[PDB]
Amino acid sequence: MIRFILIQNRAGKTRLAKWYMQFDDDEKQKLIEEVHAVVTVRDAKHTNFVEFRNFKIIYRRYAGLYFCICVDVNDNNLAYLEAIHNFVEVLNEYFHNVCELDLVFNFYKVYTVVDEMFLAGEIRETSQTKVLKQLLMLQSLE
């Protein structure tokens, strides 16, 4: 299962924190800090599947964002990496360009996209065209 999804930046600010299990108050901040410390050190010539504690994260760089899904030990590795890429591409075709400014100014749209394609810790939807169609059909309706 997916433990949490993060969309960090180069500095360390969390542009999207989405936890799928109950963590403590300071535990969330400690996890974010240590995930940032682990991810930032590595570079392109490294595996994206870095493990820590009892879990493993799936970090993928995109411009100035570090998308990270933390999965269980037994969960597959490449599938969630491609789920990250699919999520990034849905954002890219939704905002017409993905950037920190759009995430900051439209945080609730990011939350509804995440809950559209990542629900209860598993992969709710795996397609781009159908998600975009269902989101546009649920955007003109107000």
């Binding site: 597959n76 599938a79 789920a83 699919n86 992969i123 795996t126 397609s127 065209t129």
Partner: peptide
């Protein structure tokens, strides 16, 4: 065609079924 992820038919669903 809604589910062909770069000419690979439904990788996530195949992974789920194998799991």
């Amino acid at each position: 065609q809604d589910y062909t992820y770069y000419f690979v038919p439904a990788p996530w669903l195949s992974v789920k079924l194998l799991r």
